[PDB]
């Protein structure tokens, strides 16, 4: 099945289907705890702890209930609750939070917000990229209340440039083009792409993707789309055939 309770209970195992582990850094801030629950199991995570994605299904969004807490003088205080989403590929994975409740400035109040957490995996080294050819990636774009978006992305490894498109999100303004952008090395010389998104040729935000896998099998990242109701965040993950 979805292996949600397995993920909350079992040690990492490299013989499980990759990606087998994701380090929770953005997803759990220092001074805070993240409690995930699903299928009758629960686990509490701190900053830097591993999430066992090896037990989860590939190419799908896995969903947990979450509580964000802080420990104050021996007592656990709930700051936020909602759904924690995990999208798993073979060399990459990402997390996201759909907030449903926050503290009532000792009570909770309803509040909805969607953000991307961690994007990680087996980063492709910029210095070990294919020297040429053109790779096509297909996968998913997901945002608040919508995991049905389709991402297409193409990389030209000679030009070291990529571009793509998001389609089929229920909110039409989110189905943006991912404009041509250069592959660059980041601080650790990981291969990364950052560029603008476009809607009807108009600039409408940005996107960034990492390249993952020894043979650049995968891309994963996120986009920010500017709207009159705020920035909307979209998780991005795609893979070659």
């Amino acid at each position, epitope marked *: 099945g979805a292996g949600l309770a397995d993920a909350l*209970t*079992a*040690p*990492l*195992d*490299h*013989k499980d289907k990759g990606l*087998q*582990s994701l380090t929770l850094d953005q997803s759990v801030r220092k001074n805070e705890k993240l409690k995930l629950a699903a299928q009758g199991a629960e686990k509490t995570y701190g900053n830097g*702890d*591993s999430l*066992n994605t090896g037990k989860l299904k590939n190419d799908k969004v896995s969903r947990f209930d979450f509580i964000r807490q802080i420990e104050v003088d021996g007592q656990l205080i709930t700051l936020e609750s909602g759904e924690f989403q995990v999208y798993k590929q073979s060399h990459s994975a990402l997390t996201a939070f759909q907030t449903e409740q926050i503290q009532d400035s000792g009570k909770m109040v309803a509040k909805r917000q969607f953000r991307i957490g961690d994007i990680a995996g*087996e980063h492709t080294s910029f210095d070990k990229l294919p020297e040429g050819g053109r790779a096509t990636y297909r996968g998913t774009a997901f945002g608040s209340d919508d995991a049905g978006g389709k991402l297409t992305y193409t990389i030209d490894f000679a030009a070291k440039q990529g571009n793509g498109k998001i389609e089929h999100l229920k909110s039409p303004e989110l189905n943006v083009d991912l404009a041509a952008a250069d592959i660059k090395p980041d601080g650790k010389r990981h291969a990364v792409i950052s560029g603008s998104v476009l809607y009807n040729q108009a600039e409408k935000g940005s996107y960034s993707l990492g390249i993952f896998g020894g043979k650049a099998q995968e891309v994963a990242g996120s986009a920010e789309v500017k709207t009159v109701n705020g920035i909307r965040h979209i998780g991005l993950a795609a893979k070659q055939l």
Partner: antibody
Amino acid sequence: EVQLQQSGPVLVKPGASVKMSCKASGYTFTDYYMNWVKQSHGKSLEWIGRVNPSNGATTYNQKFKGKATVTVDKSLSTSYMQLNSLTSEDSAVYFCARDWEGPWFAYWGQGTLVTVSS
Amino acid sequence: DVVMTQTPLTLSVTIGQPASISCKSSQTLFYSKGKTYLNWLFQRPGQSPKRLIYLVSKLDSGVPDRFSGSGSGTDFTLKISRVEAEDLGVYYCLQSTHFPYTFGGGTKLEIKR
């Protein structure tokens, strides 16, 4: 910083038993398998067994069946290995080592030197 | 059990020269596509082993790039492009595809000077 801190050297008598410990710090103990390994003086390494710290399930090298028992105490983030019916062939250094199959760092304890003598 | 036949037993090498160690298994260490569990370890006298290479060819953090691993199936090789003085010690291969896990007998690298 991760450490695997093993218990100190010990002398034990032939025919008796010995129990040694590996205390893990700096990571969630239940997230990784733990291995135990034997090294007789001047010899190669020998794998004894592996434990799942989250539930205590174990796998053993059949050469150590009835000799070695591996356990854990989650609340103390510690693994233990007990050797029974000791002989001079059990005199060796024993190591605990975290899961070494994957990209996650393969930590080793500092070893415990066991001497079997009367 | 899977027998790991590691050769040479001793390698005597001058600083700056290359070095190669071979490990042959009695049955293939292929686990599944892209996963072959062959590690190379290194141990200084009186100290604990450390891992240098995992999954045949992946270098651990904190290991110089002079070290490389290759091979497939039953035949694996650790290479040191140019030996430095601190490379002396004992190197072991280790398979984790099959239980029981098993180790080569070790290669002791000694420095000629």
